[PDB]
Amino acid sequence: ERKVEKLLVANRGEIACRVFRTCREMHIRTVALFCEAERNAKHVAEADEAVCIGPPPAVNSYLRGEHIISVAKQLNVDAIHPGYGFLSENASFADAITRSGIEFIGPPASAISLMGSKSESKRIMEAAGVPVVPGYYGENQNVSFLAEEAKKVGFPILIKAVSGGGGKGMKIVERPEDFTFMLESAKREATNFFKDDRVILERYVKRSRHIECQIFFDKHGRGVFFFERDCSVQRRYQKVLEEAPAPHLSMETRQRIGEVALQAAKAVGYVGAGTVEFIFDTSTGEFYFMEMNTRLQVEHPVTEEVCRIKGAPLDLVKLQIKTAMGKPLTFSQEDVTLVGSCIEARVYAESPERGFLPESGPLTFIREPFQGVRGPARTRLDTGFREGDNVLIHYDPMLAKVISWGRSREEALRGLRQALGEYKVAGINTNIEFLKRCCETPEFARGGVTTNFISEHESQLLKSPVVTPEVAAMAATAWLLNRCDNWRGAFRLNSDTNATVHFYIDDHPVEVRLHTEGANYHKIFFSVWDHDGSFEVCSGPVTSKHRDQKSIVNDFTFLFENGMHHTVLAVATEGDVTVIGSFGLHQLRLLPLTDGFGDSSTAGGTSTKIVSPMPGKVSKLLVKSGDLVEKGQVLVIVEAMKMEHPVRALQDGRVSFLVKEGEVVGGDHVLATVAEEE
Template sequence: MDRLPTLQCPQLRNRSGDPVIKRVLIANRGEIACRVITTCWRLGITSIAVFTEPDETALYVKQADQVVFLGAINGPAGNPHLNIDLLVKTAHEHQADAIHPGYGYLSENDEFARAIENAGMKFLGPSPESMAVLGNKRSAKDYLLKHAPEVPLIPGYNGSEQNLSRLTEEADRIGYPVLIKASAGGGGKGMRIIHERNQLADGLARAQSEAKRSFGSSDCIIEKYVERSKHIEIQIVGDTHGQVVSLLDRECSIQRRHQKVIEEAPSPWLSADLRKSMSKTAIQIGKLLGYTSAGTVEFIVDVDTAKYYFLEVNTRIQVEHPITEETTGTDIVALQVYVASGGSLDDLNYFRDGMSPQVGHAIECRLCAEDPSRDFYPDLGTIQRWTPASEVLPTSRNEYARFDTGVHTGSQISVHFDSLMAKIIVWAPTRSRAIAYMAKLIAHTVCIGIRSNQSFLQSCLLQAKFRDPEYTTSFIPNLMTSLIKNPYVSQLDETLQLLSFIPSMLQQQRAASDLGRQRFSRIPPSFKNQRKDPANIQASVVQIPLLSNKAILVVWSTGGHSVKIIPISATEKKENSDARLKPSVRLAREYNDDISAHIRRLSNHNGLDIPAHRVTMQILSSRKANQASSDSWILDDLSVTVDAQRYTVYTACTPSPGTEPGLQQEVYAHIPALGTAVKYHSFSLLSYGESRRRLVAADAAVIDKSPKASMPCKVLSVLKKEGDVLKVGEIAMVVESMKMEMNILATTEGKFSAKFQKGDAVQEGQVLFTVT
């Protein structure tokens, strides 16, 4: 069966034939802003994007018809994206007919919706009245208990009394484990699983703190935690004529930190009867309040009993809406415009018995700037190369792939925003084909310069238990140890070491190309004048940060097509044992033992036991990331062969550092066969020796007892007092960055001394606390 085309939803026009809504201001940023801009373009609507200082070069700013600068994101008045008066004033000044809130920020704020309506504009979302009731978990459940008692609610406590004694009493009544949830928000913020009574006080304090920062309210509710559960949601759309329809279900059970990572539609586990029953319940809830626009009714399903329980209503469009669009053939953003203009869903003649047909299977994966091996610690910086698989695999663009993203080569991943970089979506006739397509797409998507969950996503997709439709929300926590391993090779370190010749071979080929345009063009790049020196051999050193900066000696044969890969034997233990020696003596001993000895051994033909690898490389294309900049990163597409094994490699590297001592060249190599990118630090023998001299001079043997901020952050709490004795692994501080809360642990035992206090802003590299 061919892939469904996206439905071009009609836009209402007035008697003169003009659209009812001509200009839309997008009160959001990132990929959702790009998504709304695309629909506006399809409908002939002018898009107006607002942006703050970190987003000046963002993709959505480039794509919009008009842009408005709102100021600094951390200015005196706070985040402009949360400033209702500023956004409404901006929309009015630019003659917008409507405002689209996206998701996050003010998208579920009834005061924002009401202010837009009072200003004479349309809010592309539900009514303020619906949002006030359904946008808050407590008020939504109270309303349903009163007006629709037949809707199944999960056992819990929804009261307003928030003191610890009352909440402890309620948790005891419900029975552990329980789930604490922020009443006013979602997205995994303000949520904690409590397994035992003695965990409640700390868990509640953390949840309330996070809820206050994220949603402006610290109120929480408590629910029974269903351990073998599925997270299923029903997409609904309502119009102003009282009609509410269901675009059926999505499965969102693959979650980390209670936040969705992989979603699929339809759920592979739901029976037809259960799907129909949940859709009817969702429609009933929507009709109770005359719901308009797009929304999502979320349920928890007990796998063991097949019973479902109402969770909440998200009164906005959601991150995962594309998979519903792909399986139903609808443009949900266009439907929001249509119903806000007064359109009737009945006139579309598309829904049967209030439900849309669902064809094929779609999967969405969220590519995030985070490190799964470090408890999903977020990353930030510059994306040095972004090449989606739709450009690498041309057929994927039209057949089954969709990329919803707000990033491009050169994009900055900022501490001020969520870690989501892109959503990768596939559609296929069957689930098994959709999984296969998605794994291939992610493997061939080049995202260089930022640590991401790219390999982790592929591990999830290719995990045998993901093929079992009965997987639950415990999928990631239960399988974490295996999911952080590379899904394609059992010994990743060996493969990365084998491919460590790529940086120096790339430099060789560039040098040869340059020589070909100069005098002495017949002299090979490996030529050295001291031909009889036994140490005169072409070699370089490569460090691999992913392998704890393991150093590799790369030694080339005289033709440059044979290479020996030799792990350097220097270890931290040996460095510590030599700590009493003078730095210059330590350096000489290390260099002689680890590099010079290997080179002379090879020169004297005593290294025959070290295998030589036959390698070739072809540069398929080469360009600068920024043609106007002399120090711009160089982007290459390579075809590399090692011992008859062929690899496609996409690289991004700094311009060659030349011969200045101590400098290195950074080379990122994205290898689809491994499904991820690896970073190499490439040195000449001279520059490597100089880099070691600097480390030795700094006395690298001293253990760093002072944890530093790896990125700009804010101190949320200091858990130890001045002079307290810290033990290894104890949590000393809690900080927040990129909308994520992180624990700072002690790496050594000693007395604690804080350098910052609660509420302080910390810059990258600053010491958070010391242990003496």
């Protein structure tokens, strides 16, 4: 075999840190890669050496496979792990690595190329004999052929069409012995949706739940399938929350899922770690092949919590290095046993209220949930970002992954709830509120959720706590104090103090007024939305005198008269005030009040504009008539004894020319009328 002492990573993020960590235990060197800048990132602070690769766009960075290979050769690298994304699925890169002599980590290039095309892949599995639900059989040569194979090839009837998602030819015709309505439905589908007259028939499944078993193989002909998984929950083809132990799955089935999976991988030949994905209908009770991926998934640490080998913790990445080592395995499929249950959820730096659009901004304060064992449950968090970091728009929005291992499902789900609640980030809106809403009200604790489970409950979700009038009181107070000495040393005569804050909550401005009575800075009141009360407030140490973009992060205490007390860590800026406490997190936008403060001119500008002196001789006018002029460009240039003396009018609005180039004009002539755009 070939010794390995240097490890190379392609991608960046959580996978970089994960690959780097175990490496320490195996006592192997590490190498990091980073784009323009991106040098303060954590992963590079974790490796032994890092190299800059070039411009931010993914074409420029992490796609120059030849340059990466040349750099690795110069470094005499032993192994490369592509990870997921970028060159994860590219057979040319793997072949070039093999020619260079470096041990590529993953499947051979032949398997990747074969699975690149869906038609040839499904051909291979059909030849292998695995139950596969195909996409098409022939064409609509005859309408009687539809009745011929309707009860033949596939009893379930999937009429549909050659293409297009309209699918009005379907009509949900699950009843066999249908011969006068299927042809009428197809012919009415052909109208206004002719496309190609060829029609394909398949089996139609009422329900769908996604399954995906894991597999592992050495290069000495020996492997063992890991435990199954579930990915029923996904929105817009994006993974949201998943469970390694498919609840409600019989043991016997588990076993069989393996025999089918091993047949397919052996047929194409496979080395390393991979995952086979199925599609399943509860009503039919059978699973049909949909797709496979020849690449390590992102969901690898999840399935790990439900599998132990020889009573020892399993490390998936470890074996992949050992597989690259050339050593053979040590365990049969038997040594592996499941223990308990676990659940996972992904947090995305997106805004749930909006069109789930990514946002980029500095990370102000990041609470870290307790990543230790307690009670009947294990909870962990893996994050590829830390304090002081900033999200890049080029990358996908992905902060951290939270997993709750437990002895029973209940324990696991309950654990997450509390953890999901505890983790807190300030600075960018996240979908963390959405995930908690997905966990509390939906009765998916039973364990039965379909592929389209998210679609129906969209009305129930997308809901957040209501900002109580009290929340404005602590939020408003923090912005003042966390900016200046408002209410500090203040003093007037025979009167009392007053200071107000305007919040632009939703599309309606909000005003909050704060004032004091007595000689007390401590005793304070409030009146928001016609609700009045009293409270006292005690601050903490003063921090962040520089009041930069991060501004001031301080803890606050508020004793309201009723009797309560509160603690609030407020990082306030001019743009917004963020308050985090037992209520949760809420950011209140401050009413924006900016509008070219100075240049606010509504003057008509009717006549006598950019008038030229006596000599005249206007020429070389470079402004189009009827075009807005707010900045002071040279509207007209007139020459008086070689005196260009450009007028440079700054009156806003479009300018209308009444003169032409080369025309001698009199003194103080109306060359143009600079009027407000009407």
